[PDB]
Ligand binder design. Structure first.
Ligand SMILES: [Cl-]
Ligand SMILES: [Cl-]
Ligand SMILES: [Cl-]
Ligand SMILES: [Cl-]
Length: 368
């Protein structure tokens, strides 16, 4: 990986529309465009890295759908067939929560994760979606998911860069699950991860991962921010290890998002929150900070330069942190209070580049 260069774009999904932030090549001044779809609840906006001119946006009302653009966001068209569960001999899609573009060798293929938990696939750039039957009708599904916050959801859909058949998914609640046959079969992969909200924490599934990532440079390495900690797994070992235990006692290792440095599998960023109350309640602290590790979780450093020093009760949701692929890597986050904070030096300094936006669900980097 050669570092990317030039302008960065941030795709910002909020409860009342989509906004877009564009930088100069130096990433010092930013331009805000939007709202796009003002009054609609936008859950996720993702650029196809295979074809940068293509973008998908998970949105509600039309009911729940996916809008597509083939001109880098200049025009949006609703799905001809959005994600919908099959007729029961039944469950209903509340919203499309997460969008993942497929493997390099399968252009036009995407996965979608819904609330309640459901996995869907498009092979036509998100125009039409069908259920991934191997998950949605798996005999263990109801046991893995359970029943009905905003509702339970499917997230962290990961397609292995080395193999389109190797997939990972995250479910709140349920856990991390793996397929080695493009989703025709799934198995739980939660070993080593706590589930302290369950009667027996040492079960196979039922866990509450918040955000899972597979490193693009070292795809055996997975990181997750869970309701019960920050974990790292080397897939060859098959166990999640709580690297979050290196966090300071007063800060803890609870939070929602997790982000990895594009080139360095040892560098990861989290946004800690107070998880000391009963499940699923996570509360903000008054002293906001991102924490970085540059040694795969052995040590953590606080990153708060430029951020409000105190009486600042910031919530950062799962999809609301992202990072670019520039040198140095820039890091960004969006708060439920409507601020977009940006760093162009791996989280060492922060600058508020947007404020007074509606409640932010997701922030995603993109190449204009
Ligand atoms: Cl449906
Ligand atoms: Cl279905
Ligand atoms: Cl815990
Ligand atoms: Cl709001």
């Amino acid at each position: 990986s050669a570092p990317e260069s030039g302008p960065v774009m941030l795709l910002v999904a909020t409860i009342k529309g989509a906004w877009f932030l564009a930088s100069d090549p130096a990433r010092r001044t930013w331009e805000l465009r939007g709202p796009v779809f003002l009054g609609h609840t936008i859950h996720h906006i993702v650029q196809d890295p295979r074809e940068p001119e293509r973008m998908l946006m998970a949105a509600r009302t039309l009911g729940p759908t996916v809008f597509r653009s083939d001109d880098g966001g200049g025009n949006w068209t609703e799905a001809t067939r959005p994600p919908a569960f099959n007729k029961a001999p039944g469950r209903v899609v509340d919203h499309v929560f997460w969008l993942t573009p497929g493997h390099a060798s399968e252009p036009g293929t995407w996965y979608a994760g819904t609330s309640p938990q459901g996995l869907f696939r498009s092979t036509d750039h998100g125009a039409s979606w069908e259920p991934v039957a191997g998950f949605n009708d798996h005999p263990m599904r109801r046991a893995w998911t359970g029943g009905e916050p905003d509702g339970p959801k499917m997230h962290s859909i990961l397609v292995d860069p080395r193999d389109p058949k190797h997939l990972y998914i995250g479910m709140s609640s349920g856990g991390v699950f793996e397929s080695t046959d493009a989703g025709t079969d799934w198995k739980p992969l939660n070993r080593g991860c706590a589930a302290n909200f369950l009667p027996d924490p040492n079960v196979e599934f039922g866990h509450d991962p918040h955000c899972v990532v597979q490193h693009p440079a070292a795809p055996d390495i997975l990181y997750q921010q869970n309701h019960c900690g920050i974990y790292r797994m080397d897939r060859r070992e098959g166990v999640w290890k709580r690297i979050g235990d290196a966090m300071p006692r007063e800060v803890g290792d609870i939070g929602f998002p997790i982000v990895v440095h594009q080139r360095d599998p040892r560098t990861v960023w989290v946004f800690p929150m107070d998880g000391s109350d009963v499940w699923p309640r996570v509360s903000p602290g008054g002293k906001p900070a991102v924490y970085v590790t540059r040694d795969a979780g052995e040590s953590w450093q606080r990153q708060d330069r430029g951020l409000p020093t105190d009486q600042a009760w910031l919530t950062v949701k799962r999809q609301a942190m992202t990072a670019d692929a520039h040198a140095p890597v820039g890091v960004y986050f969006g708060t439920t209070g409507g601020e977009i904070w940006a760093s162009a030096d791996e989280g060492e300094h922060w600058q508020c580049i947007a404020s007074h936006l509606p409640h932010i669900y997701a922030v995603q980097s993109a190449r204009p």
